Amino acid sequence: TCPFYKKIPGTGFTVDAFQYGVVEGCTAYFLTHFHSDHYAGLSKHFTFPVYCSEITGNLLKNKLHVQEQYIHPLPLDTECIVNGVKVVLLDANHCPGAVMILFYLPNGTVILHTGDFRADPSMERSLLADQKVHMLYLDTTYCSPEYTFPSQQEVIRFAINTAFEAVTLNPHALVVCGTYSIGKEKVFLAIADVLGSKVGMSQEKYKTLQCLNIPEINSLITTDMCSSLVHLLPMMQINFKGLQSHLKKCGGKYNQILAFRPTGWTHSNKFTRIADVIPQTKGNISIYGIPYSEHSSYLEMKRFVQWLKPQKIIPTVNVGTWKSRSTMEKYFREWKLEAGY
Ligand code: NI
């Protein structure tokens, strides 16, 4: 059965609730983004209305074969009416097509569901600037002060310089990048761009990328692996065995692999600065874990919330243990007392 934090009170609406069967009283299902924990349950047999971004709608149609008649894509930053309720989708600064949803309830309550987000000061000049928000359903993934990581910009800088240096020293090195979902496409795109290569990948991943409306994409990606020196592979294959095996398949074109695993936060963020990051090496294979996050750091989340000043917060992540729930509630209270709302 559908949990309470996936329901929008006073509406016919749910958010990211497709794994529960038919939800009692649900007249429209919103989907914030195409990540599997959120889309779980959707397919070609789904016959209710789904509301989402254009990009998300492209993936529903082409990857899960949902029928066109039930996909309702909405423009960003635009007041829209859905079953008699005013809504707005806003960019979530998560993966491609990821939104936050503003709901304007009949009774005057205003609710913001962030879906999955990376809070940014640029959100303080969206349509959020104009009015008060009563409830905030918040992506609390890294809601604890030990969660620090660098900006996305600093991480790409590190990666571009690393890859550029290695291939310039050895023109027979291959660069490999791990993936398991949409998101983080800048990692592999920026590296291909500095090396003047296209990024090569399987047919299923190429398809997924063709749904994302990225400008001049046909110029960056390809399924011909032989013509590319930046390869994408599934994240699980980014280990010494998986990579040695892959190198075999390249038939003596390359004699070295430099690979990257984009993670979220790892505990080595507590001690090491981005400039100081070093790989794990075995033979002619090196692997860098790089902390490219698409979720708010603690400080980025705090800033957004203390700006917003919601009357009530409902977490959507880490909600399963009393210890986590308790911890999050203590931080909300601090933030509230510190800012004075
Ligand atoms: Ni996500």
Query: If 0-12 CB within 10 Å is exposed, 13-18 middle and 19+ buried, where does residue 219 land?
Result: exposed
Fold of the domain spanning 148-295: Rossmann fold (3.40.50)
Give the relative orientation of helices 185-195 and 152-169 as an angle to the nearest 10 degrees: 40
Q: Select from 48, 95, 90, 39 the least CA-distant residue to 71.
A: 48
Instruction: Compute the distance from residue 248 Cα to the ligand 1 centre, in Å.
Output: 34
Domain ranges within the chain, ordered by starting residue: 1-147+296-341, 148-295
How far is it between the farthest Cα atoms of the chain? Answer: 68
Query: If 0-12 CB within 10 Å is exposed, 13-18 middle and 19+ buried, where does residue 224 land?
Result: exposed
∠ CA 232-234-237, rounded to 5°: 105
Instruction: Compute the distance from residue 180 Cα to the ligand 1 centre, in Å.
Output: 12
* b/e code 13-49 from CB counts within 10 Å (16+ = b): bbbbbbeeeebeebebbbbbbbbeebbeebeeebeeb
Extended strands (E) in the chain: 7-8, 13-15, 28-30, 50-52, 71-73, 80-82, 85-91, 99-104, 110-113, 135-138, 173-179, 199-200, 221-222, 230-234, 256-262, 280-282, 285-290, 312-315
**Cβ count near 233 (within 10 Å):** 19
According to the CATH classification, is domain 1-147+296-341 in 3.90.380.10?
no
Q: Residue 287: helix, strand or coil by DSSP?
A: strand
The CA distance from 134 to 150, in Å, is 31
Single-letter amino acid, residue 187: V
| 38, 13 contact by CB (below 8 A) | no
Q: Which helix (H) or strand (E) holds 152?
A: helix 152-169
Instruction: Compute the distance from residue 216 Cα to the ligand 1 centre, in Å.
Output: 25
Instruction: Compute the distance from residue 340 Cα to the ligand 1 centre, in Å.
Output: 31
Instruction: Compute the distance from residue 94 Cα to the ligand 1 centre, in Å.
Output: 7
